[PDB]
RNA sequence: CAGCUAGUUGGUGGGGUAACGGCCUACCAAGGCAAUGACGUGUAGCUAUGCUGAGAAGUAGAAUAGCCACAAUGGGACUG
RNA sequence: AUUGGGCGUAAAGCAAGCGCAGGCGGAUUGAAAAGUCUGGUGUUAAAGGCAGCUGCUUAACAGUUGUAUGCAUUGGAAAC
C-alpha cells in the first residue's frame, strides 16, 4: 500500500455551504533569508460526508484523495474533539 | 628595526601675515621579533620630523608573542570609530593588507594573516586600532593560569 | 523502441562516444535513463569498456542495439550470456 | 540567608543572566542576585565546572514559593575576572539552530559555547563529540 | 532595525542610474515602440553646430554640436581635436563621456567616423581624432 | 611580442645582470645609470611598494625571457596545486624546456637555446618539440637529436659548460636529465621572489 | 491597485471525457477568494548554469541541455 | 548592514495619549512532539564547478572517476 498522506491539522472556520466544510491549517516555516519562523494561513476544503456536523472550533485531520471538484480537493481521515 | 615610514602630512597652523607650513610624518619601526612602537612628531623640515618621530617610536615600544607565526583567534580593533578586522590565516598564505595594515603586521615579524579595513581609513586610527586589537589578545597560557583547565584544556 | 546507440560527446575530429540507452523518439546527445560505458573509436586495442551491469538489464526488459553496438556486444561475449538466458 | 533587600529578574534568563554578568565584570563586583531558573540553574554549574566563577548557592524561602540564586565570580589576588567577554547568539524571536556539522568553534577552542541540543547545557568540544548540533545558547571568551 | 519589522518591510536598494542613457534607447517604424537595449554607441545627424563657454574655472570656446540620434532623443556633444568637419545636417556617429567644462553636455564625437572627418596631422596615439599610422 | 629589443638597457634599469655576471662587467666601460636621456640622478626619490613590486616582475620575466599573459596562467596553474608558494613557482619556471636547455650549456645564450629549440633541434625523451612550454618533471631524459651537432655555436657552449647538480649531463652524447629540482640558493639570488609572488592578489 | 468573482461556491439527475471534475447540462441555495495582498498594472519563457563574491549571495538566463509555448494572424475539426 | 549600519548637535524618535490585530512575554510539574537535533531509505539528468587521473608535442582543450546541495518519508531524543 504505497500511496502517502499529508497528516496536517487543521481548523474548521464554516460549513455555511451545503454539506461542505472549510478547513484551516497554520504552516510553520523559516523565512527563506532571514532565518526568523512564522507561520501562516491556508485554508483548504473537505465536504461533509454526514457522520458528525463539525461546528465552529472542531479540529480535524486530512488525507488526500482524487480531485472530488474544483476547489474541494481532500477528504476528512480523522477527526479529534472539541476545546 | 627597519623603521618604515607611513604617511607624511603637510599640516599648518595660520597666523597673521602667512602660513607655517610645517609637515609632520608617521612612522612604524619593528624588531621584526615582536618589538612595535609608532612615531608621529611635527617639525618644519623632513629629517628632524623624521628623528623625532624615530626616538618617539623607539623610546616606547612593547611585546607581542608568536603563535605558529600569526594570531590565533579572532579579535575587532576598536578605536576612535575604525574597526579593522584580524582573523588567523593559514600558514601558507602570507601577509595580505593595505598600506599600514601591512607595514604593522610585517614589521611585527608576523606572517599569513587576514586583514579588512571597516569605517575611517586615516592612517593614525589604523595603527590606533591595530595595536588595541593586537594588545589586547589574550595568551592561551595566561588563560588557562586564571583557568582551572590549565593542562591544555 | 529503446535503442542502444551513439553519442558523439567530444571535441572535433575526436569522436568519443559514451554507449547509451536512450529511447527512439529521441535526438542525439539527448538525456537517458541509465549509462552504458563510453568509447573512444580512435584508440584501439580494449578502449572500448563497458559496465556490463545495467547494459545487461536493460536488453532483459526491452533493448535494441545497432551496428557499432552489434560490434561491442559481439567481442565482449554479451551474446553468448544474453541469447542462451533467454532461453 | 536573609538577604532583606527586594530582587526581580529582569527578562529572558540568558539575557538577565549575561547582562548581570558583563555590569559586575566592568565594576569588579563580587556577587549578584536573581531569581532562579532550571536553565539559569544548568547554566550556572556548566560554566563553573569550566571554573569561570565561585560559589553559587540557589536559595528559597521557608517555602518553596521563590527560588533566587546568587553567585561569585572567578578572581585573583590582581584583581583580574576569569571572563574575557560575552555575547548571547540566541534572543528572543531571534532563536538559533545550528546542526553539528556548522558548529562555530570560540576563539579557536579558547573560548566557551553553549549548545542545549537535547540534553541541557554542555560544551561546544564534548557536543562536537557527541556529534551532536542544536540550539546555541551565548559565546563567552 | 528589528526582525519583527524587516519582514513587514524589506529592504531596498539604491537603483544607480545610467551614466548616458540616450545611446540606450531604440525605437523602430512598423508599429514603433522603445526597448532600451543598451547601446554602446549610435550615430546620429547634426541639427545645430556652435560653441559655448565653459564654466568658472576654466576659460576658452568649445565647439559644440546638437545631434539627433537614430531614435528620437536629442543630446548636446562636443567635438574632439583640431578643427573639426561639422556640416550643418552631417551625418555622424556619437560616442560617451562626460566633460566637466560644459555643463549639459554629455558625449563626444568618434572621430575618424563616416562623415567627419579625422584631424590630420596627428601622431600621438592616432586613435582618437582618427589618424591612421603616417608614412615613415 | 615574444622578443624583446635590447638586452643591456633591461639590466640597466632593472639593476640585475641578465647574463651571470657580464651583463655590466665593464663591457665597452660597462655603466649601471638608468637608461634614457635621464640616467643623471633618479637614484631613490619614489621608491614605493608598487614601483619595486614591479621591478622584480620584471626582473622575474625577462631573464626567463617570458611576456605577461602566459606569466599569469603559469602563476594560475602553479597556485592551482598544494605546497609552498615561491619555491613550487620557481619549480616550475625552472621546468620550461627552454632553461633546462641554458641550465645543460649547450648554448651561450638562452635566446640561442630557444632558437634551436623551436627550430626541432632538440629532442625530448625520443620524442621531437617545438614548444618552449613543455613541463619537465624529475627523471625525464633529453637528448640533441642526434642531429644537428655540426653547428659552431652549440660547441664550444657544449664542451665548456657549468654543470649544475640540478641537471646532469652527458658531454659527448649530447644526453641531459631533469633529476631534482633546483634550490633557492643554487640559482641566482638578485630577484626577491616574494614580491612577486604576493604582488598577485589575482585570484 | 480595496474589494473581487455569478459556472463564480456548494449539492442533486443526466451526458460527456483516456480518466477526475460546473466540463456541460435540467433543478436548488448564495456562496467563495481577499491586508498572510485578492483583483489590476507593467515586467518576464522557467531550470541546470555563466560572471562576480570568502560568504550570506548579487546578476544574465550566451553556446548547450531538461521542461514549456509557437509556427503570417485568428478559429474549427477529420485522420492517426 | 541576516551574517554586517544608525536615529542629541552630521540624513533619521511621529506633538502627545487610548488602544484592536500582530510580535515578544514570570516560575513549577506531565504529556504529546510542530519546530529543534541526530539514524536509515528514496530522490536531487548529463554537461559545467572542485580534485585526481587519462589523452591530445603541452596549456587552450577533450575524456574518466570521486566530490557536494535540498526535499519527501521512516527510528529515535525531549534541553528549549
Redesign the interface.
Given at each position: 500500500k504505497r500511496n502517502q498522506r499529508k497528516v496536517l491539522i487543521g481548523i474548521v472556520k464554516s460549513t455555511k455551504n451545503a454539506k461542505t466544510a472549510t478547513v484551516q491549517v497554520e504552516s510553520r516555516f523559516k523565512h527563506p533569508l532571514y532565518h526568523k519562523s512564522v507561520v501562516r494561513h491556508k485554508k483548504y476544503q473537505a465536504h461533509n460526508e454526514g457522520e458528525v456536523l463539525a461546528k465552529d472550533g472542531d479540529k480535524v485531520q486530512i488525507v488526500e484523495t482524487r480531485p472530488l471538484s474544483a476547489t474541494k480537493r481532500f477528504r476528512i481521515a480523522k477527526i479529534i474533539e472539541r476545546a | 628595526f627597519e623603521e618604515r615610514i607611513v604617511k607624511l602630512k603637510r599640516i599648518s597652523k595660520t597666523t597673521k601675515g602667512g602660513r607655517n607650513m610645517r609637515f609632520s610624518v608617521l612612522v612604524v619601526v619593528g624588531n621584526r621579533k615582536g618589538k612595535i612602537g609608532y612615531g608621529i612628531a611635527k617639525a618644519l623640515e623632513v629629517p628632524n620630523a623624521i628623528k623625532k618621530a624615530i626616538k618617539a617610536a623607539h623610546n616606547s615600544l612593547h611585546t607581542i608573542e608568536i603563535h605558529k607565526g600569526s594570531i590565533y583567534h579572532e579579535v575587532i580593533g576598536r578605536s576612535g570609530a575604525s574597526r579593522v578586522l584580524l582573523k588567523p590565516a593559514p600558514q601558507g598564505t602570507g601577509i595580505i593588507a593595505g598600506g599600514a595594515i601591512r607595514a604593522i603586521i610585517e614589521l611585527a615579524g608576523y606572517s599569513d594573516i587576514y586583514t579588512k579595513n571597516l569605517g575611517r581609513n586615516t592612517p593614525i586610527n589604523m595603527i590606533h586600532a591595530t595595536m588595541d586589537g593586537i594588545l589586547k589578545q589574550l595568551s592561551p597560557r595566561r588563560v588557562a593560569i586564571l583557568r582551572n583547565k590549565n593542562l591544555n584544556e | 523502441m529503446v535503442k542502444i546507440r551513439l553519442m558523439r560527446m567530444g571535441r572535433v575530429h575526436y569522436p568519443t562516444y559514451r554507449i547509451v540507452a536512450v529511447d527512439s523518439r529521441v535526438k542525439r546527445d539527448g538525456k537517458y535513463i541509465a549509462l552504458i560505458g563510453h568509447l573512444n573509436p580512435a584508440l584501439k586495442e580494449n578502449k572500448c569498456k563497458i559496465d556490463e551491469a545495467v547494459a545487461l538489464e536493460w536488453l532483459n526488459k526491452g533493448a535494441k542495439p545497432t551496428d557499432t553496438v552489434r560490434s561491442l556486444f559481439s567481442q565482449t561475449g554479451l551474446w553468448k550470456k544474453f541469447v542462451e538466458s533467454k532461453k | 540567608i536573609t538577604t532583606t533587600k527586594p530582587i526581580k529578574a529582569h527578562f529572558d534568563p540568558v539575557a538577565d543572566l549575561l547582562t548581570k554578568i558583563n555590569n559586575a565584570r566592568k565594576a569588579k563586583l563580587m556577587t549578584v542576585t536573581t531569581i532562579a531558573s532550571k536553565l539559569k540553574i544548568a547554566i550556572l554549574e556548566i560554566l563553573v565546572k569550566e571554573g569561570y566563577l565561585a560559589n553559587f548557592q540557589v536559595l528559597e524561602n521557608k517555602s518553596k514559593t521563590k527560588r533566587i540564586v546568587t553567585f561569585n565570580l572567578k578572581y585573583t589576588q590582581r584583581r583580574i575576572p576569569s571572563i574575557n567577554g560575552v555575547k548571547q547568539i540566541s534572543k528572543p524571536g531571534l532563536r538559533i539552530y545550528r546542526p553539528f556539522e556548522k558548529l562555530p568553534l570560540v576563539l579557536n577552542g579558547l573560548g566557551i559555547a553553549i549548545i542545549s541540543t537535547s540534553d541541557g547545557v554542555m560544551t561546544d568540544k564534548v557536543a562536537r563529540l557527541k556529534k551532536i548540533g542544536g540550539e546555541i545558547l551565548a559565546y563567552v571568551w | 532595525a528589528?526582525?519583527?519589522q524587516?519582514?513587514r518591510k524589506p529592504r531596498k536598494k539604491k537603483k544607480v542610474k545610467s551614466k548616458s542613457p540616450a545611446l540606450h534607447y531604440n525605437l523602430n517604424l512598423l508599429n514603433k515602440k522603445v526597448t532600451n537595449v543598451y547601446s554602446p554607441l549610435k550615430r546620429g545627424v547634426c541639427t545645430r553646430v556652435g560653441t559655448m563657454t565653459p564654466k568658472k574655472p576654466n576659460s576658452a570656446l568649445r565647439k559644440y554640436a546638437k545631434v539627433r540620434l537614430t531614435n528620437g532623443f536629442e543630446v548636446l556633444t562636443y567635438i574632439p581635436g583640431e578643427g573639426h568637419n561639422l556640416q550643418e545636417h552631417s551625418v555622424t556617429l556619437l560616442r560617451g563621456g562626460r566633460v566637466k567644462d560644459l555643463p549639459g553636455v554629455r558625449y563626444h564625437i568618434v572621430r575618424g567616423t563616416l562623415d567627419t572627418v579625422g584631424v590630420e596631422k596627428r601622431r600621438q596615439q592616432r586613435s582618437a581624432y582618427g589618424a591612421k599610422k603616417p608614412k615613415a | 611580442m615574444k622578443y624583446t629589443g635590447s638586452i643591456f638597457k633591461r639590466s640597466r634599469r632593472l639593476g640585475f645582470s641578465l647574463l651571470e655576471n657580464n651583463k655590466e662587467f665593464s663591457k665597452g666601460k660597462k655603466r649601471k645609470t638608468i637608461p634614457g636621456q635621464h640616467g643623471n640622478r633618479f637614484r631613490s626619490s619614489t621608491m614605493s611598494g608598487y614601483a619595486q613590486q614591479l621591478q622584480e616582475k620584471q626582473r622575474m620575466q625577462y631573464m626567463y625571457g617570458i611576456t605577461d599573459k602566459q606569466f599569469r596562467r603559469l602563476f594560475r596553474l602553479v597556485l592551482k596545486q598544494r605546497g609552498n608558494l615561491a619555491v613550487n613557482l620557481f619549480r616550475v619556471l625552472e621546468s620550461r624546456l627552454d632553461n633546462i636547455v641554458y641550465r645543460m650549456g649547450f648554448a651561450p645564450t638562452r635566446r640561442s637555446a630557444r632558437q634551436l629549440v623551436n627550430h626541432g633541434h632538440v629532442l625530448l625523451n625520443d620524442r621531437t618539440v617545438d614548444t618552449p612550454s613543455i613541463i619537465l618533471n624529475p627523471g625525464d631524459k633529453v637528448r640533441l637529436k642526434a642531429k644537428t651537432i655540426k653547428i659552431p655555436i652549440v660547441k664550444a657552449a657544449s664542451e665548456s659548460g657549468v654543470v649544475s647538480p640540478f641537471v646532469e649531463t652527458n658531454n659527448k652524447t649530447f644526453e641531459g636529465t631533469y633529476v631534482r629540482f633546483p634550490e633557492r640558493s643554487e640559482l641566482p639570488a638578485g630577484i626577491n621572489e616574494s614580491y612577486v609572488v604576493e604582488w598577485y592578489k589575482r585570484l
Open positions: - | - | - | - | 528589528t526582525i519583527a524587516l519582514i | -
